[PDB]
Design a protein around this ligand. Structure first.
Ligand SMILES: CN[C@@H]1CCc2c(ccc(O)c2O)[C@H]1O
Lengths: 270, 44, 323, 313
């Protein structure tokens, strides 16, 4: 009955994934932190995590636990598209807050100039729009054709060409942007710290940046590496290793993100 | 120098009873207490 | 020399002490408690991009006026939350504002040591006789508006002539707030010298100058009956008929920001820099309840003539008009 | 009838549109308060950063005569009486004042002027020589926006200093202090300035505001240092124990003057780093025209030093 315990653990994970973003969203709505571009972006990322945990996580958990998929394929493809969109939104917001912070540091005389409520809305809307999840529903681009045809199974056996471009546009460019921006931020902070050290007498920031970089790194890199590997190399990757690792790791990312996310007063207010 | 003048001016006052003033203030608060907003006609 | 002045001060203190017949708390004992009344923000006058340092009601009990920390002056309709007029101030800093009962003009002070009266129906006139920032204003008449300045010298103006009709001086410290009685025959002023003197309308002589408070007296307001008024947390109350401290007003450690009584006088709406105004019983001398809607320190409060509700202008750019 | 509601809605929409238009500039502008010590040369920094000239000369000469009259209070006889009697102002007096300035009493008063108050001896000689080039140079708001950023300087210029408590959103508070005026009345002017800086830094309202303390008249301080008439040790006893700092960047240059300047800066920096607010010191003279550039670099080093502290690395 070890499957029962595994399912209990998965249920706890789902509940945590819901709460870790629901609390932040509720605090952002009730308090006056709104209208700030950073706060708005954090709230948007929390909303993306909440949607992902509410929709994708439980259906995938049911799929893992009970072998049969008791529902139909018309909504199953919708589930796949929703999961793709949620993962893309989480990564995109994690990159967007990085870009906002990088511009704030690198040009404070234009930091408040560039950001605006309309600008924040446009950026969030563009991030959410950036299609990559609607195409598989329509184009059906999402060799084991029976699972794509039958009703019991739901196995993700898609185009090798689609997978590479999708993974690239979803994670690789966000990875490069985040790494470059945060390295620039670290260099600027180090320069400011040395300038302060020019005072005679009288680096935690390194760890502070490293925590938030490493969370995304160690939560996202292996899944996409394995995705690219299986798109290229067919017989190398087992199914169980792919599933366990991919699903759970990326999904845990949303909770880790809420934690990474002033808020203490709002959190203590409730 | 003018402080002496101010003190002399403040010297002559017809001080009222503290108890009487307190009672008068209590009665004044009692009389006006009926129409003290602090829902039908309230603008809100 | 100064020994005569010291003797006069001692005689005044002795007369005031012996004037104490009984404690106010004795009367308060029989007074039934007001009860925990929790105000609600039935409206939210928001949309003003600054630390609003001014909050004055209108005599019509419909419109309120607030002054920016950047120079924008906006009049607000509490019923519709629609800003009727927004006249920017020539001086960037405005330290106080006031609404004339006639409503034809709205008073707006500033830190430019010049008071300017704006015409609701442009600047009608400019007053600059006093020295230092305009501490506070309250238009007594359609032509007589009382100013207040950091020069420890409050003055009366004739709006049409634009010159100081009279003069008041004598306070050691800078005066920071003034309030006028409904009888319009007297007013009070709180100064940095931890003292309050009730000047006469025309004579210019302190009727009963009291100095009970310890730190600087930030604000003072008249009782509705007009026979009494009220940086340390304590906000004492004084009865002009007896010139004593009516009641001393414990865990609070913040600074007093503004004072305003209620129509019945029972409620003494007191707002602090602790972001939460504390409403205390004026007779029972007890703390009934509090309200808190904003984030920054409260700047000023007030009560409508009709007494329907109250306003709370803070530095957080949100004027949550509690009901 | 709903016409009243429609009209009020239209008016509110127009007002909100105007406010939204103004908010961009309102947030864009950076404001600085130039709280400077009295007679510390705050005008000189303002003049460099940015009919009455003759009136100023008469005002200064009368003030110089007022100092001369005050010089009598401390410690051509008819000529001195002519100016002193005509000191208040709503040819002959001009010449009498010129002669009194030429009189040895004026030289003695200028030599012993630490207790005395003056605006000015260079102009006094110039007034005796007498507008001339740089003679006038030797809430006054300022709007001098750099080509990159919008910079507006606010002047306040009040023992209680509630004017300070009024302001809480300035980007930085300029604290001009004249280092030379340390021999110059129970407590020395430098000590009073240090007390003012302590009060400003340890201000409950001004918790999150930095101060860019430009030690003005550093050339005058070095010149007074060159002579040994009043050692800093006599005024500041801790100076004798003090030695040269480990880090030093002398211009081109006097080890004694270098020690003095670094001591003054360290004395300010101790109270600065007691307790956030970051103090950016400088050594400036009137001729130095890079004041605006230094202020710009400091300001760019404020927000960057602020955002990183604003819940970040
Ligand atoms: C079964 N879980 C899916 C499978 C494929 C996939 C995921 C996430 C982002 C993508 O771009 C994908 O192609 C995973 O969440």
């Amino acid at each position: 009955v070890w499957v029962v315990g595994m399912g209990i653990v998965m249920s706890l994970i789902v509940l945590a994934i819901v709460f870790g973003n629901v609390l932040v969203i509720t605090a952002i709505a009730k308090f006056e932190r709104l209208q700030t571009v950073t706060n708005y972006f954090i709230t948007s990322l929390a909303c993306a995590d909440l949607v992902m945990g509410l929709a994708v996580v439980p259906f995938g958990a049911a799929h893992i636990l009970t072998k049969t998929w008791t529902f139909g394929n018309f909504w199953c493809e919708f589930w796949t598209s929703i999961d793709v969109l949620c993962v893309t939104a989480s990564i995109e917001t994690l990159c967007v807050i990085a870009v906002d912070r990088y511009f704030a540091i690198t040009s404070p005389f234009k930091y408040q100039s560039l950001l605006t409520k309309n600008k924040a809305r446009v950026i969030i809307l563009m991030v959410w729009i950036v299609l990559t999840s609607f195409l598989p529903i329509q184009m059906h681009w999402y060799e084991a054709i029976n699972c794509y045809a039958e009703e019991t199974c739901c196995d993700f056996f898609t185009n090798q060409a689609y997978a590479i471009a999708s993974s690239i546009v979803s994670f690789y460019v966000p990875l490069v942007i985040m790494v470059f921006v945060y390295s620039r931020v670290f260099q600027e902070a180090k320069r400011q710290l040395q300038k302060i050290d020019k005072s005679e007498g009288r680096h935690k920031a390194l760890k502070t940046l490293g925590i938030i970089m490493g969370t995304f790194t160690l939560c996202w890199l292996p899944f996409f590496i394995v995705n690219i590997v299986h798109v290229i190399q067919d017989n190398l990757i087992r199914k169980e290793v792919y599933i366990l690792l991919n699903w759970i790791g990326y999904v845990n990312s949303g909770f880790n993100p809420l934690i990474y996310c002033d808020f203490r007063i709002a959190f203590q207010e409730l | 120098r003018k402080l002496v003048e101010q003190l002399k001016m403040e010297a002559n006052i017809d001080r009222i009873k503290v108890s009487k003033a307190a009672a008068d203030l209590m009665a004044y608060c009692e009389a006006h207490a009926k129409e003290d907003p602090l829902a039908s006609e309230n603008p809100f | 020399l100064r020994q005569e002045a010291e003797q006069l001060k001692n005689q005044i203190r002795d007369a005031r002490k012996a004037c104490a017949d009984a404690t106010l708390s004795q009367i308060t004992n029989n007074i039934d408690p007001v009860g925990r009344i929790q105000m609600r923000t039935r409206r939210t006058l928001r949309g003003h991009l600054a630390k609003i340092y001014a909050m004055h009601w209108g005599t019509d009990s419909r419109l309120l006026v607030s002054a920016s920390q950047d120079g924008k002056l906006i009049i607000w309709d509490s019923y519709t939350t629609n800003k009727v007029h927004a006249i920017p101030l020539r001086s960037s800093w405005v330290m106080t504002c006031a609404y004339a009962p006639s409503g034809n003009y709205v008073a707006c002070g500033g830190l430019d040591n010049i008071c300017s009266i704006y015409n609701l129906k442009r600047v009608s006139r400019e007053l600059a006789g006093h020295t230092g920032y305009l501490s506070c204003c309250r238009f007594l008449d359609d032509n007589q508006i009382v100013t207040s300045s950091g020069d420890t010298t409050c003055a009366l103006w004739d709006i049409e002539t634009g010159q100081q009709t009279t003069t008041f001086t004598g306070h050691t410290g800078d005066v920071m707030s003034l309030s006028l009685a409904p009888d319009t025959r007297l007013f009070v002023s709180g100064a940095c010298d931890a003292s309050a003197k009730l000047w006469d309308v025309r004579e210019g002589m302190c009727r009963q100058t009291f100095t009970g408070h310890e730190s600087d007296i930030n604000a003072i307001c008249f009782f509705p009956n007009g026979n009494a008024f009220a940086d340390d947390a304590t906000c004492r109350l004084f009865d002009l008929r007896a010139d004593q401290e009516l009641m001393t007003y414990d865990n609070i450690i913040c600074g007093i920001t503004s004072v305003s009584f209620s129509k019945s006088g029972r409620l003494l709406l007191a707002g602090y820099d602790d972001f939460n105004c504390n409403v205390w019983d004026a007779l029972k001398a007890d703390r009934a309840g509090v309200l808190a809607g904003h984030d920054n320190r409260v700047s000023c409060l007030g009560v409508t003539d009709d007494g329907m509700a109250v306003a709370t202008g803070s530095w957080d750019s949100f004027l949550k008009i509690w009901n | 009838q709903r016409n009243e509601e429609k009209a009020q809605r239209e008016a509110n929409k127009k007002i909100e549109k105007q406010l939204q238009k103004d908010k961009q500039v309102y947030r864009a502008t950076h404001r600085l308060l130039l709280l400077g010590a009295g007679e510390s040369g705050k005008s000189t920094i303002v003049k460099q950063m940015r009919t009455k000239v003759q009136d100023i000369k008469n005002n200064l000469k009368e003030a110089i005569e007022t100092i001369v009259a005050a010089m009598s209070n401390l410690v051509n006889q008819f000529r001195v009486d002519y100016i002193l009697s005509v000191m208040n102002v709503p040819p002959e007096f001009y010449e009498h004042a010129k002669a009194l300035w030429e009189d040895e009493g004026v030289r003695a008063c200028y030599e012993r002027s630490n207790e005395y108050q003056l605006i000015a001896q260079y102009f006094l000689d110039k007034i005796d020589v007498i507008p001339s080039d740089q003679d006038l140079l030797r809430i006054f708001e300022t709007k001098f926006q750099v080509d990159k950023v919008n910079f507006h300087m606010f002047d306040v210029g009040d023992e209680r200093r509630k004017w300070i408590q009024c302001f809480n959103d300035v980007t930085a508070i300029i604290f001009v202090v004249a280092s030379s005026s340390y021999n110059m009345n129970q407590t020395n002017r430098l000590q009073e300035a240090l007390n003012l800086f302590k009060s400003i830094w340890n201000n409950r309202w001004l918790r999150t505001i930095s101060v860019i303390l430009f030690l003005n008249k550093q050339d005058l301080l070095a010149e007074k240092v060159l002579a040994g008439k009043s050692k800093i040790e006599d005024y500041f006893p801790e100076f004798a124990r003090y030695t040269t700092p480990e880090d030093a960047t002398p211009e081109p240059e006097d080890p004694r003057v270098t020690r003095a300047k670094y001591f003054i800066r360290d004395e300010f920096l101790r109270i600065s780093t007691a307790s956030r607010h970051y103090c950016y010191p400088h050594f400036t003279c009137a001729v130095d025209t890079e004041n605006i550039r230094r202020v710009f670099n400091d300001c760019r080093d404020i927000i960057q030093r602020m955002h990183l502290r604003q819940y970040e690395l």
